[PDB]
Design a protein around this ligand. Structure first.
Ligand SMILES: O=c1[nH]c2cc(C(F)(F)F)c(N3CCOCC3)cc2n(CP(=O)(O)O)c1=O
Lengths: 169, 49
């Protein structure tokens, strides 16, 4: 009962924290002219110690569209905003459960936020064209925890719907 | 100031009017200079290329 809900809540909280850490720094690694890390906003070298915003969008129209999407991180920022909205919806549905159908829309928004985060990871992997950062693996692990939390949330929702259907008869 | 010029000087009519010229040793023309076409990132068009 409450154990699965608390596990889903701490999984959503850990996924939001790892998404924030993926937004922050150390997302990728690229050897410049010496190694240098990047966190999709600015690059920092391994002289040594200086940091600057190296997310310059200039140096068919599909290349300009892909460069515009890769600039300023349109997909993962909106994905993190949708994850925060899903966490707020799960917190509003945890206490005073009046309507028994908002959890389905919250889970649908949570799965769509996970799919958008995976799509943004695909965009950031495509725009990379030599190693990888740790925040990329942290964002992948947060995507795994988000998928498992969505499965647990829809499992609790179908269990609550089956309990309501059994209590209605 | 000179005796003979052995250099790539363009044979024109206005230069014929003052000095003389021999038969051409190498013919040429105006050509097109472009870069060598290297590999470009194809993108979404590779789904049904
Ligand atoms: O007598 C002329 N002989 C010329 C000989 C040459 C070359 F031999 F190739 F060096 C060139 N270049 C073209 C290519 O790049 C470098 C310079 C220009 C010449 N021009 C100027 P034009 O009037 O624009 O032809 C003459 O007048």
């Amino acid at each position: 009962r409450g154990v699965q809900m608390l596990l889903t809540t701490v999984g959503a909280f850990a996924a939001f924290s790892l998404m924030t850490i993926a937004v922050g720094t150390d997302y990728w690694l690229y050897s410049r002219g010496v190694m240098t890390h990047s966190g999709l906003w600015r690059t920092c070298c391994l002289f040594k110690g200086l940091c600057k915003q190296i997310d310059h969008f200039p140096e068919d129209t599909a290349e300009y569209f892909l460069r515009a999407v890769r600039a300023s991180s349109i997909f993962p920022i909106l994905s993190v905003i949708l994850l925060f909205m899903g966490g707020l919806c799960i917190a509003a549905s945890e206490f005073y459960k009046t309507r028994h159908n908002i959890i389905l829309s919250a889970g649908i928004f949570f799965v769509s936020a996970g799919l958008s985060n995976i799509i943004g990871i695909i965009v950031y992997i495509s725009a990379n064209a030599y190693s990888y950062g740790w925040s990329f693996y942290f964002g992948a692990l947060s995507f795994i925890i988000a998928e498992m939390v969505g499965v647990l949330a829809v499992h609790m929702f179908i269990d609550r719907h089956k309990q309501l259907r059994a209590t209605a008869r | 100031k000179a005796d003979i010029a052995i250099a790539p000087l363009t044979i024109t009519l206005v230069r014929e009017e003052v000095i003389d010229f021999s038969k051409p040793f190498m013919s040429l023309g105006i050509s097109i200079m472009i870069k060598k076409p290297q590999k470009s990132k194809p993108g979404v068009f590779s789904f049904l290329d």
